[PDB]
Amino acid sequence: NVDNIRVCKILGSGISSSSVLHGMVFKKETEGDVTSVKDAKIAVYSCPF
Amino acid sequence: MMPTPVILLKEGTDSSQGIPQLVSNISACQVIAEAVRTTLGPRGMDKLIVDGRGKATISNDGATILKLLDVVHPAAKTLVDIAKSQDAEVGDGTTSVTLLAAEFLKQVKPYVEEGLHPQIIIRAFRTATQLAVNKIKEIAVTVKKADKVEQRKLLEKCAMTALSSKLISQQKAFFAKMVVDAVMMLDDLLQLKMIGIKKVQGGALEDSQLVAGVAFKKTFSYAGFEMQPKKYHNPKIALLNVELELKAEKDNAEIRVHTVEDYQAIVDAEWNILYDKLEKIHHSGAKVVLSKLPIGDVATQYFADRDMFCAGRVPEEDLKRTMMACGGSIQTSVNALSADVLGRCQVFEETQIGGERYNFFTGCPKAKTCTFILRGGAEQFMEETERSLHDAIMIVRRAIKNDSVVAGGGAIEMELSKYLRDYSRTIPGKQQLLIGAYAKALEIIPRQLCDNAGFDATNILNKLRARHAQGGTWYGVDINNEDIADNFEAFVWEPAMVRINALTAASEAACLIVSVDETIKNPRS
Amino acid sequence: KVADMALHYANKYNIMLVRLNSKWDLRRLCKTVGATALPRLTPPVLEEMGHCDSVYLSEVGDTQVVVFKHEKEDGAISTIVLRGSTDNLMDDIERAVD
Amino acid sequence: ASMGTLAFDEYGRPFLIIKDQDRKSRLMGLEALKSHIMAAKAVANTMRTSLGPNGLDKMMVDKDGDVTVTNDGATILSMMDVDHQIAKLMVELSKSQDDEIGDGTTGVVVLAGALLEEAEQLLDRGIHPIRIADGYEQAARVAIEHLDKISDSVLVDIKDTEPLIQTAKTTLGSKVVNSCHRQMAEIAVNAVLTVADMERRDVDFELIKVEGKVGGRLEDTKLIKGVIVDKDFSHPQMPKKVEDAKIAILTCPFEPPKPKTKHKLDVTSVEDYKALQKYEKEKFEEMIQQIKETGANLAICQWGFDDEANHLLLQNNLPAVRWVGGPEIELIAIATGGRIVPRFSELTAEKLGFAGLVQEISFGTTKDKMLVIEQCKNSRAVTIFIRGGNKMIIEEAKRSLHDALCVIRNLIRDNRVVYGGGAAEISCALAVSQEADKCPTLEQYAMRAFADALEVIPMALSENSGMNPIQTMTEVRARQVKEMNPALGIDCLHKGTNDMKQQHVIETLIGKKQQISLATQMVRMILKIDDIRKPGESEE
Amino acid sequence: LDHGARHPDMKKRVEDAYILTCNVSLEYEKTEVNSGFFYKSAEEREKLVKAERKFIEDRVKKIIELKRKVCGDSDKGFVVINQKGIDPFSLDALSKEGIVALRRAK
Ligand SMILES: Nc1ncnc2c1ncn2[C@@H]1O[C@H](COP(=O)(O)OP(=O)(O)O)[C@@H](O)[C@H]1O
Ligand SMILES: Nc1ncnc2c1ncn2[C@@H]1O[C@H](COP(=O)(O)OP(=O)(O)O)[C@@H](O)[C@H]1O
Ligand SMILES: [Mg+2]
Ligand SMILES: [Mg+2]
Secondary structure: OHHHEEEEEEEOOOHHHOEEEOEEEEOOOOOOOOOEEOOOOOOOEOOOO | OOOOOOOOOOOOOEEEEOHHHHHHHHHHHHHHHHOOOOOOOOOOOEEEEEOOOOOEEEEOOHHHHHHHOOEOOOOOHHHHHHHHHHHHHOOOOOOHHHHHHHHHHHHHHHHHHOOOOHHHHHHHHHHHHHHHHHHHHHHOEOOOOOOHHHHHHHHHHHHHHHHOOOOOHHHHHHHHHHHHHHHHHOOOOOOHHHEEEEEEEOOOHHHOEEEOOEEEEOOOOOOOHHHOOOEEOOOEEEEEOOOEOOOOOOOOOEEEEOOHHHHHHHHHHHHHHHHHHHHHHHHOOOOEEEEOOOEOHHHHHHHHHOOOEEEOOOOHHHHHHHHHHHOOOOEOOOOOOOHHHOEEOOEEEEEEEOOEEEEEEEOOOOOOOEEEEEEEOOHHHHHHHHHHHHHHHHHHHHHHHOOOEEEOOOHHHHHHHHHHHHHHOOOOOHHHHHHHHHHHHOOHHHHHHHHHHOOOHHHHHHHHHHHHHHOOOOEEEEOOOOEEEEOOOOOOEEEHHHHHHHHHHHHHHHHHHHOOOEEEEOOOO | OOOHHHHHHHHHOOOOOOOOOOHHHHHHHHHHHOOOOEOOOOOOOOOOOOOOOEEEEEEEOOEEEEEEEOOOOOOOOEEEEEEEOOHHHHHHHHHHHO | OOOOOOOOOOOOOOOOOEOOOOOOOOEEHHHHHHHHHHHHHHHHHHHHHHOOOOOOOEEEEOOOOOEEEEOOHHHHHHOOOOOOHHHHHHHHHHHHHHHHOOOOHHHHHHHHHHHHHHHHHHHHOOOOHHHHHHHHHHHHHHHHHHHHHOOEEOOOOOOOOHHHHHHHHHHHOOOHHHHHHHHHHHHHHHHHHHOOOOOOOOOOHHHEEEEEEEEOOHHHOEEEOOEEEOOOEOOOOOOOEEEEEEEEEEOOOEOOOOOOOEEEEOOOOHHHHHHHHHHHHHHHHHHHHHHHHOOOOEEEEOOOEOHHHHHHHHHOOOOEEOOOOHHHHHHHHHHHOOOOEOOHHHOOHHHOEEEEEEEEEEOOOOOOEEEEEEOOOOOOOEEEEEEEOOHHHHHHHHHHHHHHHHHHHHHHHOOEEEEOOOHHHHHHHHHHHHHHHHOOOOOHHHHHHHHHHHOHHHHHHHHHOOOOHHHHHHHHHHHHHHOOOOOEOOOOOOOOOOEHHHHOOEEEHHHHHHHHHHHHHHHHHHHHEEEEEOOOOOOO | OOOOOOOOOOOOOOOOOEEEEEOOOOOOOOOOOOOOOOOOOHHHHHHHHHHOOHHHHHHHHHHHHHHHHHOOOOOOOEEEEEOOOOOHHHHHHHHHOOEEEEOOOO
């Protein structure tokens, strides 16, 4: 599937610094105080929290 | 041009193609670079730009100036974009990028005029940039001792160098020490939102202070606020996200009663709800109460009767800074106000600061945030002080990330030009001209420093070239002494990543501009 | 959206909150993580629970990003982080990637 | 010499870079600096006539025709409809001096203009403007150190306030209230000392109420150790004077309770209607009874009340005032020593404020009634009531008294003083000149220019008083050098002596330091601007 | 048909299929006589929310029971083509039972 490849454009360091990540990147911020998880257990809700 | 009965593109489409188009692109790039040329080095000058609304802005920062000019030339916007990129990734050197890119284009303009294929020029730029970046990484000076005092001195010197081009350059040591302390107080992510910057009109630059805690302006106190004490010697702070007011229980809540005592009970129940919230807050043990949501007059008088402090409508960023400094949690409910969710600071005080009232939280020993209170005689004065402090903060953060420095004042670029010329002397000869042009274009920054300070650029450039060729790496422009000097022993230090990103962005912009052969402009919709 | 009381109680229990505004991104995250988009606030059953090697907040350049990262070199969705000095240059590189 | 550049390409193709580049403009290099210096010189020369006891006022007219005759430099510059950016910078400098100090708003502008004039001369001699700014900064540091050296300390004790009176008199000398000079100075000193946290802490300015009412005379202006209220007694037949009033501050309207939440009380039968009517009547009766039970004599409300409550208050011998604003409620509570009670159920005797006298005041043939609350025990809030022959002198007296209050606040914050009349400026110029002699040559010119720019204040003072500027300033400087006395200034009032210490011309040290600092920084920022890019559109 | 299943978990290809052509609205519908909900607590609100979808869930459960009665194995399958809309809740309920559904058919 072509759509399974995502491109994230972040300005600043020249194209030689590009890299591939096995996952996804969102240009956003966390809502709460926790900002890092090492054994993530994501629960996804389509409804408002 | 024969008028075809049916035209191909829309009427009014403008197309320019060929060598003249690229020559015009180069000329426009130099036009843009001229607008920021004189804002370089300690002897730089500020620019004043007035928008349509008539609100002027005064700045020495190249990226800011370029953003305020409304550039519409498509090739010229590349310089503005690379200035923005340099500001985003590094934060300093937003002028050197534009001068370097325009100088590259100017140096390769004569070869373009004589029909040289632009792919050759692009390849030469890529090779020269790679070699220069490798040389920068190789010759950058780093100390593998992890000495705390040495790290402090390195950061202070880098901040002083970053600050020695702005209107606050006379107090550059003071501001550099402040910025280094501020960056140290941040914990691990060096988030900019954890360094508050408050600008208060009136007062000297030396009146600016850094508070080891959090400070924010007084926020629309209600009646009975003046009856509250304004100094606490060991307060516990209740950080809240709560609207302490008499109000409807919910927007969609409706009350239906059919008896008078039920009416009285409902009124007393609303009052009891408000007093229950206030009583829980009071018995939490806190003395200072802050809320993101408004705090009404009834709650203000209630806290005044208890010798407590209240402040509603506090901005969210200020509440975050207070939580980071004091160590509590922003509670949306007051049902569990335990000791671990209450902030704690040594001294809380409200003081008069230049015609305004500010709440000060000082004495926090575990504070991970800080607030700058900048004093100045004008709005733009304090804005430019903030911009200079932002440059210094970004420089110090990047230096925290890695302690690699190269001497400033054009010494690094003279060394790079010498190395590139030595390399170019040993190649077949078609790329030799272009790499030599790249090395010559690398000489723009020391030349611009000499021009801005009023020297004779040619003599200083000749002396620098001779010094670099005969041996010596960190010899740059000495502005005060009218000569050249070793800029490493003069503590003109800048992080290597600044020049690395500057060269990379300038090379990319030059290659993108050169690679274009035709510009087509559709009619505006 | 996230309610204030909900955010409070999530902070109290040390739970990371991410608010994906677009449903395409939500679907792609579900694919790359292995979770099911629950239409209610019911606790997720074992199969519907998503897993990832590391989730964290990071800053690239001057942009705040949230990264869902797998240590293994495999997965349903892989992303390319394109750096550059101009927006047009990154758009050209993206066209080349396409 | 505008729009930037215009080439239209070497090949004739269009060359458009900046949007509307054919309508914009730009100034570069020394020409922009000369234009800025000219603008600042114009502003400073306009301001310099309003300096000193013999200074003259400016009659300012706004958009709608309102006229404000004033001598305050910050006010004048705030009401000027300037368009030049450097003029706006000068206005900002004056406003900053007003904010930080409150006095000396005219000295900063004159000093900045003199500094920029000397910088223009140096630029014409061929010096980099950054060198001029550096020399100015060095000379400012030297002058600030000298001011610290030659300062004197004064007592800020309540028992002896003579130095405070003298300082306030010096501040008020240039204003129109110099007719009531000593009275104004004394009331300002008393006002500041009354509302102040004594341990060198801040003086809180929302504890001073300043109101002006037309009629009467300026001499009728008095200090009220209480609160003046624009309201009056609600019932026309209530007594106009209450003695030993026990105030009852309330923020609840004397009306039946009303829940905030959307509510609907259903009346389903005649019994329900009777119960509702009886409930309303009993609510009125019981709120009046609860107010009376505490023993209060005067009831103050914020949200007003209706006819039944008014007549019940009149019937129960309870004078009352309604619709009192929130700030006035707070001031009354602070002065009388009472607490603000949000509902009658919580009203107790211990929450009552005490006022020695509450009176209603008439103001001639005007129907206007205002309430006086005074003779409090330990009133922590004070009020200044200003009278005059027209509203314009009332506004001028308001701002002059504000200047005096700010000056006494500065004295409370820091009690070191220096002597005015240009003596401090002359001494600073002498110190700068002496320092420049030992200093290397290149910045010697900048330091000498700074000294000459400092010397403008004695020159302006002497010129305003009709004396010859250069002769008087030179004589005073020679006298200062011959005998060590930094207190010799310009005898503006022609008292026969040049010793300002004997003449009791006293200035706050921090005021002069702020003047020098702000002038130096603003001059540096103006000197560093070498480029202007105006839209040049001149839109309607 | 120029439309497909709107739920990501729907099967993309069914070998042996029973076709159920229906003109029944499987999405949430409002009372014609301005119903409105009144509650006095959060628990009552949750109960009313859970009890307001019983009407739709009854028809969804009828479809589920028919499918389970007809094809008890996983060899066959159901395709439900509905002329009216199907809300995400009904789509999820049908997808949990391995039924592919189409909505808003001509
Ligand atoms: N004290 C100094 N002496 C000589 N050169 C300096 C000094 N401080 C900074 N420079 C040079 O001035 C150049 C421009 O720096 P600056 O104007 O602060 O920011 P930008 O790089 O954005 O223009 C830098 O390349 C640096 O080498
Ligand atoms: N009685 C006086 N004799 C001599 N000089 C005075 C006297 N009173 C005021 N001055 C001088 O007049 C100058 C201007 O003061 P003023 O006009 O009141 O406020 P500003 O400092 O804002 O202009 C002061 O620097 C002060 O030294
Ligand atoms: Mg810099
Ligand atoms: Mg004055």
